[PDB]
Symmetry: D3
Subunit: 117 residues, 6 copies
């Protein structure tokens, strides 16, 4: 699956090839942008508050738990995806790694089985 690394403020630092395939942004396009560009509203506007809340409280909601969420492609289409977040440290500052698993195929098979009785 796809891999993204962000700094303590949600800025994309590293964007894997698979992330380019999934989200539609090239590495140069994605790096330097806030990770919130990869999700729809309301999560998009709230994303910084999610990171800030974790830095303040150290209380995890997805970190070490995982969660299926809605992601957004550059073309504006949305998709279901599983998200796991790793916490790292480099040069005195926090960095977060995001592993993204596209569940579009799963969602469609399930809806199709439901739709066929």
């Amino acid at each position: 699956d796809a891999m993204i690394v962000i700094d303590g403020h949600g800025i994309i630092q590293l964007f894997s090839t698979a992330a380019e395939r999934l989200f539609g942004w090239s590495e140069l396009e994605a790096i330097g942008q806030n990770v919130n560009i990869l999700m729809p509203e309301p999560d998009r506007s709230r994303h910084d508050s999610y990171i800030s809340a974790y830095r303040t409280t150290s209380d995890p909601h997805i970190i070490g738990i995982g969660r299926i969420v809605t992601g957004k492609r550059r073309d504006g289409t949305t998709f279901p995806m599983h998200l796991s977040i790793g916490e790292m440290q480099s040069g005195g500052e926090p960095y977060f790694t995001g592993f993204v698993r596209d569940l579009t195929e799963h969602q469609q098979t399930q809806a199709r089985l439901q739709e066929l009785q």
Copy 2:
């Protein structure tokens, strides 16, 4: 899973043992019959048009894509199944191979999990 081979007009040429188990027709019973006997209406009556449309346009809908569809047993019961279609040539004429995966178990587990809250 089950395997069927048809000629360019939808006539069953080869019918595997697993196809006999799934559809309820023996090989001798199935061979020489149109593949449309394995599906309910409206697909059943439209099936020849689907094959003819592909021979004319060469524009695929399931070939090289795959699709979950409703199949029909000889006893008249229907079931969800995944279908993949391979295109072959033998003695100057087109033949199509169909690989069928019975998704009855999957559909029932899913409906049951949904029904139990």
Copy 3:
């Protein structure tokens, strides 16, 4: 997954560690109790009749078939689980083995994919 063994009257004889983790009862707590404590009503009150009906008729409903059912934890929360039942004999009397697979994760992933369009 979890394993439980009961006598011909539904009394728990053996309760695996994994069963302790899933149901919330320790082995000493569970042993000597009727297996009906592991399920909600109406199955709970009917459970003895299910065992008695099998001893009389020898007609199986889950034995050698399997079934997804709702189980109940000691804290009173319910969960979906797959149940397989094995039939054994020891010292002239019937014993039944129950293999339990927790499908909570499966049910939640499915509901979540459905809820996200």
Copy 4:
């Protein structure tokens, strides 16, 4: 896979259907016999010492670890199998559960791949 339950002295108390298929002994034949009948020498003669050593020291070698060992069928043929052992208590005495996974297929595929260059 196969399931066996023994008392604190290695006597078979319960023998699943799958264990009957794998080992070649029927449930009535197996129950009341020492579990050592299911393995070749030298493990066979040493088996009681393995159980006794655990009761004395409480130091596990397979319990909670697992191990691939050589098992023996009634017809005298041997096979590789994975063994996991669960420890239980019933009516003041220890009982042990053995889950057996036949690895014959695995061993043969591996030897065959090795033998074909």
Copy 5:
């Protein structure tokens, strides 16, 4: 995996796309050729005798059993593969279906793990 269909004399009748990828022969190249071109000697020269022996005796060695064998590519390189054979009838004559699973990756991983201690 790859699929091939032969007549009662070992002549290739149908050759799937995946078979073209695995063996190196195109469908037109393969059709009309004996299936023995897909294996090295000594199996190659003996192959007709294997089919003839089955037609005479009806005693199976791979049919309904399966077997890992050495296959051969057009470029002359050999590889390990699993073979399953289905028996069919069409227009009064026997046809055989061969499902081929390339085990090159498996063999190499295994040899590599062995070579690294």
Copy 6:
């Protein structure tokens, strides 16, 4: 599995929790060290030449191919592992991501099956 990120000179920039578990080095201990500390000789001394050779030639040996290699823990024990390498760019410089899959379990099961006939 484990994840490591290095700069264009083999210096560890990010070291995941799973990498800490596998290699035995904490993140602070690993960061700033050359990736060659994670492998035995001769690869260890040659590692810089492997990276330099890729920067010069752009000719891949593991990048986009994968390879099972011998890794080394801090305690000095070695293990078989599968390695996949991703190539990234950040702030005008190349970075490489390494995904490490511990194959110790696989190697031991295989050796054990071989050793038991």
